[PDB]
Amino acid sequence: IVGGTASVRGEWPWQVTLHTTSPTQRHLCGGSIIGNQWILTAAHCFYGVESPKILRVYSGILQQSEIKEDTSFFGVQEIIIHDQYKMAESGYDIALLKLETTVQYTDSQRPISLPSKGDRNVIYTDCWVTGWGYRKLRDKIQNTLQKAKIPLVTNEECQKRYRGHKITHKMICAGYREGGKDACKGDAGGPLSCKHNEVWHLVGITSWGEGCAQRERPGVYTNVVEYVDWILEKTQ
Amino acid sequence: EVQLVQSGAEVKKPGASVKVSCKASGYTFTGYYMHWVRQAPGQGLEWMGWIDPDEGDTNYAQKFQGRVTMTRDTSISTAYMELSRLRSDDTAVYYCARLASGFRDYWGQGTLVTVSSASTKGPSVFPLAPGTAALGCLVKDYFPEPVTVSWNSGALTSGVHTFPAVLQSSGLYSLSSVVTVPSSSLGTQTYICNVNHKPSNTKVDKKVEPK
Amino acid sequence: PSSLSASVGDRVTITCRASQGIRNDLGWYQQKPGKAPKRLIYAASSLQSGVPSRFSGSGSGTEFTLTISSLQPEDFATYYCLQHDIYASTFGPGTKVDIKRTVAAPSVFIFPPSDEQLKSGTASVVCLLNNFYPREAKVQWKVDNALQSGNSQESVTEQDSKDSTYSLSSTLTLSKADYEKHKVYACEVTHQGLSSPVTKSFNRGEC
Ligand SMILES: [Co+2]
Ligand SMILES: [Co+2]
Ligand SMILES: [Co+2]
Numbered sequence: 001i002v003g004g005t006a007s008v009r010g011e012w013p014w015q016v017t018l019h020t021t022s023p024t025q026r027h028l029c030g031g032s033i034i035g036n037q038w039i040l041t042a043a044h045c046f047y048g049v050e051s052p053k054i055l056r057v058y059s060g061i062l063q064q065s066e067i068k069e070d071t072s073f074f075g076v077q078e079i080i081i082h083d084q085y086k087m088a089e090s091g092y093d094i095a096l097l098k099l100e101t102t103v104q105y106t107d108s109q110r111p112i113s114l115p116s117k118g119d120r121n122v123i124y125t126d127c128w129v130t131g132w133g134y135r136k137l138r139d140k141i142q143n144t145l146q147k148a149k150i151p152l153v154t155n156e157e158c159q160k161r162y163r164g165h166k167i168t169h170k171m172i173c174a175g176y177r178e179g180g181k182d183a184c185k186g187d188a189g190g191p192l193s194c195k196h197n198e199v200w201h202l203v204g205i206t207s208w209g210e211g212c213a214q215r216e217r218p219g220v221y222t223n224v225v226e227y228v229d230w231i232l233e234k235t236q
Numbered sequence: 237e238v239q240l241v242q243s244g245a246e247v248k249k250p251g252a253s254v255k256v257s258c259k260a261s262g263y264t265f266t267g268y269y270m271h272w273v274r275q276a277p278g279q280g281l282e283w284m285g286w287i288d289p290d291e292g293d294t295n296y297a298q299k300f301q302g303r304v305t306m307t308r309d310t311s312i313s314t315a316y317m318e319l320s321r322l323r324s325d326d327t328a329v330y331y332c333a334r335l336a337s338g339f340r341d342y343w344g345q346g347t348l349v350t351v352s353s354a355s356t357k358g359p360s361v362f363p364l365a366p367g368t369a370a371l372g373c374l375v376k377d378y379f380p381e382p383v384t385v386s387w388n389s390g391a392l393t394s395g396v397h398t399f400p401a402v403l404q405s406s407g408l409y410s411l412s413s414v415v416t417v418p419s420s421s422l423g424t425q426t427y428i429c430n431v432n433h434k435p436s437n438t439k440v441d442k443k444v445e446p447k
Numbered sequence: 448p449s450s451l452s453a454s455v456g457d458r459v460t461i462t463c464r465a466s467q468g469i470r471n472d473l474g475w476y477q478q479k480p481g482k483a484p485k486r487l488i489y490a491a492s493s494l495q496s497g498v499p500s501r502f503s504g505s506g507s508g509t510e511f512t513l514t515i516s517s518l519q520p521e522d523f524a525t526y527y528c529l530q531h532d533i534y535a536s537t538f539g540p541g542t543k544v545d546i547k548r549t550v551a552a553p554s555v556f557i558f559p560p561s562d563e564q565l566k567s568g569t570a571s572v573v574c575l576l577n578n579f580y581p582r583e584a585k586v587q588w589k590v591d592n593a594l595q596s597g598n599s600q601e602s603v604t605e606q607d608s609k610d611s612t613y614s615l616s617s618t619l620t621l622s623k624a625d626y627e628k629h630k631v632y633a634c635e636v637t638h639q640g641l642s643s644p645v646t647k648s649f650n651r652g653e654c
Binding site: 029088134138211212 | 471491507
C-alpha cells in the first residue's frame with residue numbers, strides 16, 4: 001500500500017494473508033474472509049500455483065513476523081477460479097478458496113458482508129484498501145498491515161485513463177487524480193472495503209494497476225457486486 | 237550527464253570471493269536503487285539484486301542468496317557487490333545499473349570477473365599461412381580474456397574476422413584471427429598480426445608468410 | 448534463448464510472460480555485442496525518452512509484448528524483458544533479431560598446423576568458413592577418414608557490419624604424435640547455400 005498508515009490489531013478482521021510454502025514460506029497475496037470456509041481473492045495470484053497443497057491462509061494477523069513455525073493456519077482444499085479468467089487477460093480476476101477447516105469467529109477474525117445484488121457503488125465515500133504490499137513501485141513486502149483511504153472513480157473516468165485496456169462494469173477503479181495512495185505489488189487479492197451506514201462491505205478485490213499510485217492512473221479492482229451470483233453458486 | 241564507473245577486471249580462484257565497485261555521478265545517489273546484472277560469455281542477462289542506497293535495504297535473487305552481499309557508501313556515491321564461494325560459472329561481465337522506472341536507465345561499463353585455477357599467461361602466436369586468399373593467426377593458450385588482434389598495425393581492417401575465444405579443457409583460451417586478401421598481393425604486401433594481451437603485458441607481432 | 452531472422456521493414460512482436468501482480472512493471476531492453484543493454488520501454492508501455500516511436504509495448508494479464516513497427520538497420524540486436532515481481536526481478540531469455548540477407552554459401556579454407564606449433568609439441572588444424580548466411584552450418588572433421596568428435600571447438604563471428612554474413616572457425620586439436628601418425632585431414636562442411644557438402648583437405652607434407 002502506497003501512502004498508507006499502520007493498521008491496528010483487530011481493525012480489519014476479514015483480511016487474511018495467503019502464503020505459499022514453495023520454495024520457501026512467504027506472503028503471496030491478500031484475501032477476505034466471506035464465510036466460515038471461504039476466502040475471496042484474485043485469480044491472478046495463482047499464476048504458477050495450481051496446487052492447493054502449497055497454500056496456507058493466516059487470519060487475525062497484523063504483522064507477518066507474528067507467523068511462526070507453530071502458528072495456526074488454514075489449509076486450502078480447493079482453489080476456485082472463475083471460468084472466464086484467462087492468463088492472457090486482466091479481467092474476471094476473482095477466485096475462491098475453500099478451506100479445509102472452519103474459521104472460528106472472534107473480534108479479530110470474522111467475515112465481511114458482501115454488497116447485495118443490484119447495490120450501487122456511487123453510494124460509497126469511505127473506502128479503504130489494505131495489505132502487506134509495497135510502499136512504492138520497487139520495495140519489499142511490509143511487516144505491518146497497512147491501510148489507505150482512496151476515492152472510487154466512475155467507470156467512465158477510469159476508461160479515459162486506460163485507453164489501452166477494456167475497463168468493464170465488472171471492474172471498479174479507485175484513486176486520487178494526483179496519485180499518492182493506492183494498492184501496490186503484494187496487495188493483490190485483498191479487499192477494497194467501504195463503510196456505509198456503519199457497516200463495512202466488500203466492494204473490490206485488488207487486481208491490477210499501471211504502476212502504483214501514479215497521477216491519473218487509478219488502481220483497478222474486481223467489482224464484487226457483479227459477482228455475488230457467482231459467489232453464491234460456487235459456495236453451495 | 238549520468239555516469240556509472242566500475243572497478244577493473246578481476247581474476248579469482250574457485251572458492252574465493254570478489255568485490256566490484258560502482259561509482260555514480262550526475263544524479264542524487266540516494267534517490268534511485270542500484271541493480272547488479274551479470275552476463276556470462278555468450279549468454280543472457282541475469283538479474284542479481286538491488287540495493288537501496290537511501291535506507292540500505294537489499295534484495296537478492298534466489299540463486300545468490302547466502303553468497304552475495306551488496307553494500308553502499310553514500311558519501312562517495314559507490315555501490316559494491318561482493319560474491320563469495322566463486323565457481324567457474326560465475327565467470328561473467330558484471331554491471332551495475334540504475335533502472336528506476338519513469339527515468340532513463342544508466343549502466344556501468346561492466347567488469348569482467350574470471351573464475352579459474354589457471355595462472356596469467358601470454359599467448360603463443362602461430363601463423364595460418366595462405367582470386368582471394370585467406371590467412372591468419374592462431375592465438376593460443378593464454379589466460380585470462382581479453383586479447384586484441386590487429387593487422388598491419390591497424391592499416392588492414394577490410395576482410396578481417398577475429399573470432400570469439402574458446403576455453404580449452406586446459407583452462408587456457410585460444411582464438412583465431414583471419415583476413416582474406418587478393419591472392420596477387422601475397423607477393424608484395426607483408427601481413428603481420430599484432431596481438432596484445434594486456435593482463436600479461438604480452439605484445440607479439442607475427443609475420444604470416446606464404447607456404 | 449531465441450533467434451528471429453527479419454528483413455528491414457518487417458514488423459516484429461516479441462512476447463514475455465509475467466505475473467499480472469507486477470502491475471505493469473516490465474521493461475524491454477536492447478543489447479548489441481560488446482555493449483551494455485539500453486532500455487527501450489518501461490512500465491510495459493511507456494516509451495523511454497530518446498527512444499524512437501517505432502518501438503511500443505503492451506501488457507494484458509500475464510502477457511507482455513514489444514512491437515517494432517518497421518525494423519530499421521540499427522534495430523538488429525538482442526531484446527530482453529525484465530519483469531519486477533514481489534520477491535525478485537527476472538530477465539527473459541533473449542530474442543536475437545538477426546538480419547535476413549540473401550543465402551550465401553561459405554568459402555571454405557583449411558590450414559595445417561604451423562612448423563612452429565609442431566615444434567612446441569601440439570598440433571591445431573583450422574577450418575575457416577567464410578562469409579556465409581544463414582548462421583547454421585555444420586563442420587565435421589575426418590582424420591584418415593575416421594570421423595572425429597570431442598577434439599574440436601568452434602566459434603562464430605557476429606553478423607558483419609557491411610554484408611551481414613557470418614564466419615566460423617573450427618580448430619581440431621591433436622597431439623603432435625597423432626598428427627604425424629596420420630595422413631589425411633579433412634573438414635567437411637554442410638550449409639543451406641551448398642547443394643552438396645564441401646570437403647577441404649590436405650595431406651600432411653603439403654596438399
Ligand atoms: Co457464516
Ligand atoms: Co579498479
Ligand atoms: Co595498450
